[PDB]
Each structure stands twice: as structure tokens, then as C-alpha cells.
Write a protein that binds this ligand. Structure first.
Ligand SMILES: Nc1ncnc2c1ncn2[C@@H]1O[C@H](COP(=O)(O)OP(=O)(O)O)[C@@H](O)[C@H]1O
Ligand SMILES: Nc1ncnc2c1ncn2[C@@H]1O[C@H](COP(=O)(O)OP(=O)(O)O)[C@@H](O)[C@H]1O
Ligand SMILES: [Mg+2]
Ligand SMILES: [Mg+2]
Lengths: 532, 180, 523
């Protein structure tokens, strides 16, 4: 019966398949959680090697064909696009919540009550997170950002050398701060030039105070070191003039063809002379420049860079205070060039960095820019360093925007689990087991952290639970809630004075996203696949 | 932008192209510059006629036969401090005209200042990482139209929320029509 | 059939680590053959159909197709080391292999790689500190010291019987390439030193020239082929009547219009030629083509013209004489005319015309003329000359010297052993293993020489144990201990530092993999 012409599943078959898929997805990315786990390796079909362990890239480059896993993949992608850190922890939490809700569903319990209990537990955990908050501007301030950057760069390739990288990230963030309405401290990212060039090691990767360009000089006759130059931003092709499609040329007098051909080349010369009439040295062009136009810049003693990206030119004009002029037209009917919209750089030196060369630009007089040139071994190390730098920058930006820090590790999850266990006694309805399952699902992060460290997990979990229970009751011991988890030896320590520092916007958003994913997946019990 | 005046434009702002096959025959060395000078003068006159009305938010419809906005006109409008939104389709014209209350203009000879819509806030918002969004709040003569923004983590959840909202709207409409 | 992923294979961690270690050991054992002056040459068979007979440690690696990611990473780091300094391509691979071999023993003892990487970095820091402390300065004005350094650096290649002149040739090329344009930036880009290879002749006739060499000929046999002090001019435009670009049409209706156009074309050609002749030229070097009217007009004034030249050749000619490439014949002026030419002779080298421009006043671009047998020998000589030039450039850029052979390695090992006595915890065993692993270069040299590994090794150890013997090395020609202060073998410190850093980075990158997921068809 029921002519469908396709495979279908009704009952506990699709639920078990989804549970197995979620468990496999969680176990796939369970070898790179925390500073103890190592990295991964992804190879295609032609021989290209890709080494990464961020979490989102592993799920993106894996070729997922199951919808239950595609949901987790797109959720991790959205989490990485939103904040930028915490892409695997949210997926692990969602998988654990799904595995815990499957046992309740199989126990002849309606999924609506389980969903309501999970929502109540998530709301209680969100309301309880705002209680344990530490203001970063009320303590030292400078010593907290360094610790946060070291924690964000503790599970990457630069785990040991994290003292100088944290200071470099802090300096880049302080130099990249923009000025707007002066109401809230805005720190925009994706504005520095991250160049990858092999050669030197990691300690020789200093911070350049200014913007860097990934282009070389035009002609060989142009100088490569001009002190106190003027940056000129152009957005038009500097080649020979050509008529449009609707404008033709019908030669009727031989005494004018030579004059027209001479004017066709003299127009560009006059335009170049009018542009360089203000004494310009650094000229940036997005389009191509002909070989005849470079002779003027060579004889005039100036630099002409072509094939410049739009974003780089915009950043240069914003840092130097210049204005990108798409044309020479003004408020009248004549092409004139003024000197009020010109740059003012300090020194432009084209230094050679491993065979290939690049143009370096220092700070100007309007704003201050920054660029980090990371040096690795081959190509995968440079990509890993760039990813770690981007993650550290995003973490620092989120910390500076939230103005609060929370000691990460196996402390916040245990505290939330204890608070949910102490709250289940008030809910006398059918949502008592849902809160218990939600509290038990949050304890999977310390278990995985202890498993990856190859240490005792049950004893450490019991000790952390006992410490949290002793710190909850009796107000005389309220300072024991900042224990955290030390995986270097296997004993609690101080995770607040000098341990782990993490923002509060990562845990709440990840928990809410995991709860939403669990809710939107648990309401599935019928799969219908049509034949192609 | 604070206290802007929205204006609808249904004509292109590029080179003058007639309905028939047009062409320019160049025979002198000065005609190549004279044509460009006349084009620049026409563009400047059009920009001055647009700026004379006191508009701030310009809306240009989509054109496939020719360019609706060139680079010179865009540069002139940017220098004159005028926001240009050249991304209007041909199906959402009635909705915009009923919401913001602005009559469509298809000729510069009828683009009078009284044919513009008064706006109180014409700013753009930026999300955490999913593209930009334009919002227009504040109108002198509002209509009977409204919009609902649906968010969510997954596209399936957003589609389910939209379907639920549509079902609720249909239920409310049926309850209003039946009065029982 | 419900599956999570199609065509995907996942392995464990211990198996992947063992496979990577085995691949690294195999690569190190394959590359260890070409090491020391007693090594042999290898030959490859590229899919094109040629023969690559050389002795460089990187050329043999670039002609081998592999499939393991560890081998690919090793090839990549070797190519980066070659592109950085040019020397130390096999030493870094051997060091990485020995580090992997001595680290697999600790990895088999259920030890975490984090402490291993920490100890590796702490040992690399101490190695860099010791190498900077044992630095030896050197003057840049002493030509004999630079010649001896170049000879000791190129004593491994087959030019051990002809380095008496190749060293001087490389020194002259380095001195001529070094040029300071504007500002205080002294660049040393190796792009104006064209090394041409011509088959035939003896290897003793190969000598550097004070100019450039163009493999072309004159456009007309009536032109001069031997000028004393000519005025070579440069051009970049075309000397012929070409079309436009604005789509122009000519509509004629009379009779003399065709003749008028044909006369105006010749008038414009004659005007351009007069504008070129008005500056009194001699040798015209253009990159485009010349017709017949311009050639006749240039021959009427006894002017030589060369057609079809490359951009790099034009830049080398401009840098050698001292002129500039101008594409505007109407605005050539006088300052754009080079007067540094002193000789312009065109000879025949085996049924082939060659243009020679030498006897320059102060040239900045030289051309190395190589005369050998076939093509493989010429390519090997060119590679050896390029390596010698890169070594000389790295020496002139950083005047630092360290004792060659196995003296510096033994000194660093002894320093690390003496410094490890004040350490505690579990970080002492890797700190001692990385110190004992530095003896892989002298052991390989001895195995390639006298094959007395244990005896010579313990002798060198007992010699370096003293507090006044840190420059004692092993001779690669006999097999006895000899101090480096009386032999003359020296190596740049920057090259050794870069090699050590690359080896440490490769070991760190290889000691952190535990899962290989292949099978996603890229993207
Ligand atoms: N130095 C550290 N000490 C203790 N715990 C840490 C340290 N660094 C990271 N962690 C913990 O490891 C967990 C995983 O973080 P990480 O592996 O960096 O990626 P993600 O934060 O995206 O999961 C975090 O929840 C954090 O609490
Ligand atoms: N004549 C020699 N005397 C002492 N040591 C030598 C001699 N020739 C080569 N060596 C040593 O052999 C090592 C390998 O040198 P070589 O094979 O020429 O280049 P690479 O260092 O790139 O392998 C060098 O570190 C050098 O110290
Ligand atoms: Mg992280
Ligand atoms: Mg060598």
C-alpha cells in the first residue's frame, strides 16, 4: 500500500540512525579538544595536504551526505561565523544532549516535556552565567588580555611560544581600534595584512607598524626607497584612450588622421602631467598601466604600482587619510587635480623577503595601521599560524566588546550542572528528569579533557563535583568555585588569579545554539527519500 | 543619515541613448574632446538638477537594456553627499510606493521636490556575520503595510517559523471574516 | 544503504605516527648517499625525455614523485631551505630524520608529544644561543679569505679541479651585481647575471665578461660589426606603421587619396627616423620589429639596429651601459644615451652569430660564458656557480663564520650535555637525545670516508671533552682528526642557523599528527 516509490522509516529506526550519526560526528572531532589534543590532516584526490584542527574546517572538508550531520555542520559553520571561537565544544554539547534525550525518549516519555525541560535548563544556565562574571577593567586589565590570548592560542601550533604572540595581538588590536561615535569601544578585525612567506622561524616574525602590500614595482628604473612621499589613490585605467562602441571615426581628410593619432597619445600624457603636477611620488593603480605611461614615472622619479586590490587601496586611503578619486572631474567642466587629497607616508622601502619582494608602508599622519607577516616552514604551518592568529584576534575582540571574562575549563560546566541538580527539586512535574539529563550532558567536557590527557577521569570528576558542592553551600567557602582543571599534572589549582580566561559571550551563544539544534532535531521521526 | 528625503528614480543616469540606432561620426581632432566635455556637462547638469530638489536617499530601478548609473554620476552623487541604492526590482514598486509614500518619477522635467517622501531615519545595520541589511523607520504619511523579520539558526527552522506565522495570519483572517 | 561518508578511510594514531617515522627514515637513508666530498653523482629520468645528472641534494628530491604526506612535507621544507639560502639541503633532511628516529623511542614509551615539542624548542633556543656565542667575525675587504671560503664551500662538487678560476669568477660576479641605487638600501637580487651555456670548447676558456651577450645578428649585412666607442641607444616602441584601436574608417572619393596616404606614411616614417637620428645614435636596441624604410634610413646614416630582444636582456643592457629604456622617440633627450660601451664585436660560435659588448667603464651586469661538452655538464657547472654566488652573497650579508665539518656539532652537543646537568623532571631525556643526535653528520662523513664510526667518534668525543678543543673536526679525505685552524674549512653561521631552524620546525610539524582522513575529492 501507499504508492510512494521511495525508502521510508517510521518508529525507532530513524531515531537510532540519527543518534549513531551524531555520535560518529562527535567522535570524529573528539581528538582535537583542549590544549592536549593534537591536529588533524586532510588529503584530497590529487595530493594536496591540509593540516588543521579548528573544528569548522574539518566539518567543511569532509563531504557530508547525511542531513543529520549536515545540520551539525551548518550549525558549526554559523557558530564560527558569529563569534569565531568554540566550534567543536558546541557540537560536542549538542551531541551529548541528543544522546541523553534519546534515552528519555526511549523510556516512553513524550518529547514535548523533554524539550520544555531542556529549554528551562538552558534558561536557568543563561541566568546563572551572568552571576559569575569578572570585570576586566576593574582588576589589572593589561594582564587579562594576555592571558586570554595565551588561552586562545594554547591548543594550536604556537602553544609554547604564546608570550610574544599575545603581546603582538594586543598591540595589533590597540593599533587597529577605529574612531566612530565615541560611545562604545569598537575593535574591527579583518584589517591587517597577514602575509605567509617561508624562510625564517617563529621568533623572527615581528610586527610591522604599518600596512604591507603584496605587489612589486612596475619598471626597473623606478626607485625603491622614497622618504617622505605622497600616496596617490586612483581607481581608473592608466592606458591609451579608446572611443566607445557608439562613437566611430570616419576619416574624410588625410590632413587630420595624423593629428588625431597624435592627440590619442598626447591626451594620456597631458593627464599624467596634470596628475603629477602636485608633486606625487607613490601612485597606486588598480587597473593595468601601459608601457608608454611608465616612462614618465621613471623619468620623473616616482613609483607606479599596478594590479592593486580594492580592499588594500581602501585601507591605505583610510590609514593615510587620502580619498580614492575615480575620476579627475570636479564641480565644473575641467579635469583638475588638487593637493588637498594626497597622502603623507613616512618611508616606503621595498624589502626582499625570500626571493619574492613586497612593498612595505610605515605609519602616516592620519591613522595608524598594522600588519603581521607570519613565517613558517612549508605551506601548512603558515596556514595554521594564520588561523591561530585570526582566532586570537577574534577572541581578543570578543573579550574587549563583552568587557567581562569567565574562568574557563571544567569549572563552569560543573557549576551549571550542580545548579541544575539543585534546581530539579523545585520542579515537581515531568520535567525533573530533563533537568538532570541537561546537567549530566554538560559534564562531558571534563570527561573528554581527562580522556585526551590519558589521566584518571572518574576520580577527577568526583573531586571537582565534591569541591563544587562544598563551594555552593556554606558562604565561608565561596572562593572554591574558581578551581578549573589543570591537565598538566591532574590536580585543581587557581584558575582565576593566573589560569584560564575566557569571555562570557562564547558559552551562552554556544549553549543556546546547541539547545536549538537539539530541539529542532528531536522533533524528527519520519524520513522519506524519493528516487532520483 | 538623519532626516532624509527618499526619492524614486525610474530613468537611467548614463550616456544619452535614443530608441533608434544612434552613432557619432568623428572627423576632427577636437571632436573627441568636445564629445567628452559635452557628456561631462550633461552629467553635471543632471546631478545639479537632482541635488536642487534636496534629495538624500536615491532609489534607481533595475535596467537591463542600458547602464542605470555610470561611474561619473556615482562619483558626483558621492561628492554631493547623496546615498545611492541602485537595486530596485520591478515587482516591489507598489509596495514601496504604499509604504514610504513616494510617487515614481520617470523624467527629470517632473522631478519636483513635493514628489518626495519624508523620512525620519534612513540608516543601515550590520549583523554579526551574515550580510548587511537596510532598514527605513519613520514616515510622515505611513500606509497600511508592515514587514516581519524572521531569524533562526538553521534555514529549516526559519522556514518552519515563517509557515507558522503564515498559518496564524490565515487563522486570524478567517476569524475576522467569519466574526464567530 | 545508509552511509555517513563515501570513499573515506580513517586510521589510528600510533600506526600513522609509525608510518610517518618510517617514511622520514627512508627519505633520510635515501638522501644520505650524496654527502661529503667522497659522495657520488646521481642521474634521473624525467617524463619529458631528458637526463638530470647532478649532485645537489635538492635536485634529486624534486624529481621523485611520492604519495605520503610526510614525504611531501619533507620535499616542501627542502625546497624552502634551498630557496632561502641555497646550501644545506641534505643536512636539514638528515637532521630531521635523526630527530624523528631518536624521538620515536620516547614516543613508544607512552609519552605525550607536547613535552617533546617543548624540549625540542628549549633545545633549539640553546643551540641558537651557542651558535651566536661561538660566532667568528670576518672582514669583507680580504679577497683571499672570501676565495678560500668559496673554495671550501664548493670543494664537494666536481669543480674541485677548476675552482682556481671559478672562485674568482664568482667573486667578480658578486662584486659587479652589488649596486646601490637610491637611498640606503643595498639590494643583491640575482637577476642581472645571465649565465649562458654554449656547447663546445674547453672548460678553461670559461671566463666572466664585463658586459652582456646577445644571441642575435644585424638586420643588414652592410651595417658595421666592429665599433670602437659607439653610443648605444634603447627603444621600446615599434618603428613601423601599425593600426589604431578606436575603430577608424577611411572613406575616400577622389583619385590622389591613395597616393597621398602612401606618401604621408613614408613622411611619418622619415620624420620618426630623423627624430631618432637627430640625437646621433649608433646601436639601436628595440624590442619590436623594423620594416624596410626605417632600416634604409638608418643605413643611410650608418646606424646599427638589433631586432627581437627580451625584456631581461634589455634591462641588463641598460644596467651595464648606464642608459634607460625610453618608448617615446620624440622625447629621447641626451641623458638617456649610454656612453659606457667600449667594444662591440660580433663573432661566430659554431654557425651562430653572437653579439659581444665588453670593455665597459663601470658595468653592473655581467654574463657568465660557459664552455663545456654536452648539456648536463654545463647545467651542473651553472648550478655550482649559482650556489657559489649565493654562498658569497650570504657571507657578505652576514660576516659570521663557524668551524666546519663536525667541530661545531660536537661543541654544541658538549654544551647541551654540560647544561643538562642542572635540569630536573622528565625534560632531561629528550634534551640529551637531541644533543646525542647532532653527531649524525660526522658519523655519516666517517662512514663515507674510512668507515671507522665508533673509533673516530669516541676519539672526537674525548678530544672535545677538554675545555680548550672546540674546533677539532674530521677530515673527509683521509680519516684522521685535524684542527680547522690549519685546514681552511669554514661555513657561514646564518646557513647553519637556518638549517637548524628548518629541521626543528619540520620535526615539530611531523611530531603532531595522529589521524589521516583522505577521500573528499577536494572541493
Ligand atoms: N591552558 C588551558 N588550561 C585548561 N583548559 C584549557 C586550556 N586551554 C583550553 N582549555 C579548555 O579546552 C577546551 C577546548 O578549547 P579549544 O581546544 O581551544 O577549542 P574550542 O574552545 O573551540 O573547543 C576549552 O573549553 C577550554 O576550557
Ligand atoms: N673538505 C671537507 N672538510 C671538512 N668537512 C667537509 C668537507 N667537505 C664537506 N664537508 C662537510 O660536509 C657537510 C655537507 O656539505 P655538502 O654536501 O657540500 O653540502 P650540504 O651541506 O648542502 O650537504 C658540510 O656541513 C661540511 O661541513
Ligand atoms: Mg579555542
Ligand atoms: Mg653543498
Amino acid at each position: 500500500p501507499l504508492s510512494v516509490f521511495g525508502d521510508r522509516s517510521t518508529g525507532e529506526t530513524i531515531r537510532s540512525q540519527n543518534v549513531m550519526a551524531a555520535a560518529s560526528i562527535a567522535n570524529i572531532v573528539k581528538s582535537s579538544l583542549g590544549p592536549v589534543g593534537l591536529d588533524k590532516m586532510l588529503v584530497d584526490d590529487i595530493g594536496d595536504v591540509t593540516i588543521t584542527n579548528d573544528g569548522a574546517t574539518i566539518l567543511k572538508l569532509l563531504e557530508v551526505e547525511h542531513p543529520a550531520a549536515k545540520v551539525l555542520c551548518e550549525l558549526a559553520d554559523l557558530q564560527d561565523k558569529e563569534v569565531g571561537d568554540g566550534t567543536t565544544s558546541v557540537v560536542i554539547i549538542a551531541a551529548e544532549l541528543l544522546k541523553n534525550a534519546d534515552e528519555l525518549v526511549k523510556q516512553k516519555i513524550h518529547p514535548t516535556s523533554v524539550i520544555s525541560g531542556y529549554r528551562l535548563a538552558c534558561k536557568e544556565a543563561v541566568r546563572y552565567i551572568n552571576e559569575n562574571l569578572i570585570v576586566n577593567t576593574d582588576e589589572l586589565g593589561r594582564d587579562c588580555l594576555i592571558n586570554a590570548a595565551k588561552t586562545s592560542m594554547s591548543s594550536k601550533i604556537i602553544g609554547i611560544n604564546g608570550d610574544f604572540f599575545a603581546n603582538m595581538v594586543v598591540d595589533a588590536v590597540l593599533a587597529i581600534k577605529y574612531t566612530d561615535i565615541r560611545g562604545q569601544p569598537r575593535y574591527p578585525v579583518n584589517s591587517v595584512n597577514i602575509l605567509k612567506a617561508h624562510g625564517r622561524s617563529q621568533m623572527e616574525s615581528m610586527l610591522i607598524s604599518g600596512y604591507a602590500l603584496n605587489c612589486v614595482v612596475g619598471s626597473q628604473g623606478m626607485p625603491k626607497r622614497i622618504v617622505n612621499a605622497k600616496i596617490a589613490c586612483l581607481d581608473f585605467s592608466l592606458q591609451k584612450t579608446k572611443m566607445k562602441l557608439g562613437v566611430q571615426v570616419v576619416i574624410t581628410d588625410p590632413e587630420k588622421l595624423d593629428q588625431i593619432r597624435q592627440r590619442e597619445s598626447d591626451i594620456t600624457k597631458e593627464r599624467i602631467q596634470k596628475i603629477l603636477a602636485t608633486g606625487a611620488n607613490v601612485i597606486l593603480t588598480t587597473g593595468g598601466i601601459d608601457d608608454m605611461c611608465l616612462k614618465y614615472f621613471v623619468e620623473a622619479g616616482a613609483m607606479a604600482v599596478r594590479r592593486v586590490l580594492k580592499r588594500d587601496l581602501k585601507r591605505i586611503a583610510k590609514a593615510s587619510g587620502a580619498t580614492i578619486l575615480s575620476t579627475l572631474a570636479n564641480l565644473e567642466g575641467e579635469e583638475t587635480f588638487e593637493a588637498a587629497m594626497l597622502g603623507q607616508a613616512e618611508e616606503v622601502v621595498q624589502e626582499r623577503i625570500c626571493d619574492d619582494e613586497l612593498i612595505l608602508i610605515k605609519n602616516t599622519k592620519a591613522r595608524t595601521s598594522a600588519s603581521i607577516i607570519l613565517r613558517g616552514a612549508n605551506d601548512f604551518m603558515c596556514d595554521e599560524m594564520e588561523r591561530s592568529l585570526h582566532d586570537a584576534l577574534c577572541v581578543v575582540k570578543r573579550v574587549l566588546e563583552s568587557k567581562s571574562v569567565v574562568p574557563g575549563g571544567g569549572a563552569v560546566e560543573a557549576a551549571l550542572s550542580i545548579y541544575l541538580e539543585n534546581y530539579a527539586t523545585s520542579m515537581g512535574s515531568r520535567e525533573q528528569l530533563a533537568i538532570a539529563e541537561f546537567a549530566r550532558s554538560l559534564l562531558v567536557i571534563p570527561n573528554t579533557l581527562a580522556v585526551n590527557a590519558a589521566q584518571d577521569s572518574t576520580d577527577l570528576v568526583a573531586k571537582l563535583r565534591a569541591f563544587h558542592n562544598e563551594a555552593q553551600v556554606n558562604p565561608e567557602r565561596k572562593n572554591l568555585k574558581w578551581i578549573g582543571l589543570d591537565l598538566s599534572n591532574g590536580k585543581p589549582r587557581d584558575n582565576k588569579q593566573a589560569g584560564v580566561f575566557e569571555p562570557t559571550i562564547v558559552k551562552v551563544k554556544s549553549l543556546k545554539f546547541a539547545t536549538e539544534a537539539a530541539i529542532t532535531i528531536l522533533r524528527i521521526d519520519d524520513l522519506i527519500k524519493l528516487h532520483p | 543619515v538623519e532626516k532624509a528625503k527618499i526619492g524614486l528614480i525610474q530613468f537611467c543616469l548614463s550616456a544619452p541613448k535614443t530608441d533608434m540606432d544612434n552613432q557619432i561620426v568623428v572627423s576632427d581632432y577636437a571632436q573627441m574632446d568636445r564629445v567628452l566635455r559635452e557628456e561631462r556637462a550633461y552629467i553635471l547638469n543632471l546631478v545639479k538638477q537632482i541635488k536642487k530638489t534636496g534629495c538624500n536617499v536615491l532609489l534607481i530601478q533595475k535596467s537591463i537594456l542600458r547602464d542605470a548609473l555610470s561611474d561619473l554620476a556615482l562619483h558626483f552623487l558621492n561628492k554631493m553627499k547623496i546615498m545611492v541604492i541602485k537595486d530596485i526590482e520591478r515587482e516591489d514598486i507598489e509596495f514601496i510606493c504604499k509604504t514610504i509614500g513616494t510617487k515614481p518619477v520617470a523624467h527629470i522635467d517632473q522631478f519636483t521636490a513635493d514628489m518626495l517622501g519624508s523620512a525620519e531615519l534612513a540608516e543601515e545595520v550590520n549583523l554579526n556575520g551574515s550580510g548587511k541589511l537596510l532598514k527605513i523607520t519613520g514616515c510622515a504619511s505611513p500606509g497600511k503595510t508592515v514587514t516581519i523579520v524572521v531569524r533562526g539558526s538553521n534555514k529549516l527552522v526559519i522556514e518552519e517559523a515563517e509557515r507558522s506565522i503564515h498559518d496564524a495570519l490565515c487563522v486570524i483572517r478567517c476569524l475576522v471574516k467569519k466574526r464567530a | 544503504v545508509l552511509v555517513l561518508s563515501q570513499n573515506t578511510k580513517r586510521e589510528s594514531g600510533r600506526k600513522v605516527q609509525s608510518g610517518n617515522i618510517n617514511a622520514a627514515k627512508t627519505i633520510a637513508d635515501i638522501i644520505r648517499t650524496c654527502l661529503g666530498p667522497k659522495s657520488m653523482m646521481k642521474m634521473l629520468l624525467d617524463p619529458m625525455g631528458g637526463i638530470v645528472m647532478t649532485n645537489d641534494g635538492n635536485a634529486i628530491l624534486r624529481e621523485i614523485q611520492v604519495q605520503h604526506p610526510a614525504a611531501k612535507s619533507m620535499i616542501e621544507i627542502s625546497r624552502t631551505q634551498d630557496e632561502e639560502v641555497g646550501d644545506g639541503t641534505t643536512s636539514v633532511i638528515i637532521l630531521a630524520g635523526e630527530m624523528l628516529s631518536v624521538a620515536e623511542h620516547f614516543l613508544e614509551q607512552q609519552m605525550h608529544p607536547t613535552v617533546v615539542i617543548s624540549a625540542y624548542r628549549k633545545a633549539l633556543d640553546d643551540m641558537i644561543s651557542t651558535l651566536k656565542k661561538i660566532s667568528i667575525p670576518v672582514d669583507i675587504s680580504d679577497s683571499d679569505m672570501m676565495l678560500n671560503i668559496i673554495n671550501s664551500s664548493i670543494t664537494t662538487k666536481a669543480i674541485s679541479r677548476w675552482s682556481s678560476l671559478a672562485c674568482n669568477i664568482a667573486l667578480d660576479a658578486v662584486k659587479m651585481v652589488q649596486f646601490e641605487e637610491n637611498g640606503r638600501k643595498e639590494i643583491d637580487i640575482k637577476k642581472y647575471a645571465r649565465v649562458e651555456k654554449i656547447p663546445g670548447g674547453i672548460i678553461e676558456d670559461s671566463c666572466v665578461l664585463r658586459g652582456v651577450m646577445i644571441n642575435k645578428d644585424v638586420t643588414h649585412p652592410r651595417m658595421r660589426r666592429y665599433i670602437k666607442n659607439p653610443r648605444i641607444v634603447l627603444l621600446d616602441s615599434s618603428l613601423e606603421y601599425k593600426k589604431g584601436e578606436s575603430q577608424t574608417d577611411i572613406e575616400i572619393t577622389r583619385e590622389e587619396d591613395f597616393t597621398r596616404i602612401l606618401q604621408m606614411e613614408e613622411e611619418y616614417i622619415q620624420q620618426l627616423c630623423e627624430d631618432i637620428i637627430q640625437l646621433k645614435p649608433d646601436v639601436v636596441i628595440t624590442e619590436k620589429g623594423i620594416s624596410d624604410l626605417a632600416q634604409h634610413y638608418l643605413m643611410r646614416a650608418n646606424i646599427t639596429a638589433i631586432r627581437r630582444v627580451r625584456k631581461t636582456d634589455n634591462n641588463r643592457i641598460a644596467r651595464a651601459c648606464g642608459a634607460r629604456i625610453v618608448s617615446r622617440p620624440e622625447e629621447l633627450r641626451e641623458d638617456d644615451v649610454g656612453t659606457g660601451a667600449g667594444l662591440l664585436e660580433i663573432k661566430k660560435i659554431g654557425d651562430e652569430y653572437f653579439t659581444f659588448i665588453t670593455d665597459c667603464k663601470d658595468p653592473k651586469a655581467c654574463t657568465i660564458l660557459l664552455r663545456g661538452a654536452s648539456k648536463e655538464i654545463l647545467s651542473e657547472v651553472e648550478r655550482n656557480l649559482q650556489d657559489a654566488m649565493q654562498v658569497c652573497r650570504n657571507v657578505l650579508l652576514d660576516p659570521q663564520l663557524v668551524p666546519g665539518g663536525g667541530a661545531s656539532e660536537m661543541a654544541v652537543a658538549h654544551a647541551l650535555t654540560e647544561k643538562s646537568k642542572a635540569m630536573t623532571g622528565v625534560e632531561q631525556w629528550p634534551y640529551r637525545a637531541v644533543a646525542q643526535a647532532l653527531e649524525v653528520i660526522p658519523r655519516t662523513l666517517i662512514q663515507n670516508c674510512g668507515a671507522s664510526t665508533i673509533r673516530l667518534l669516541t676519539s672526537l668525543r674525548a678530544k672535545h671533552t677538554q675545555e680548550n678543543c672546540e674546533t677539532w673536526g674530521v677530515n673527509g679525505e683521509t680519516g684522521t682528526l685535524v684542527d680547522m685552524k690549519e685546514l681552511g674549512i669554514w661555513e657561514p653561521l646564518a646557513v647553519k642557523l637556518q638549517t637548524y631552524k628548518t629541521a626543528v620546525e619540520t620535526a615539530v610539524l611531523l611530531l603532531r599528527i595522529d589521524d589521516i582522513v583522505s577521500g573528499h575529492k577536494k572541493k
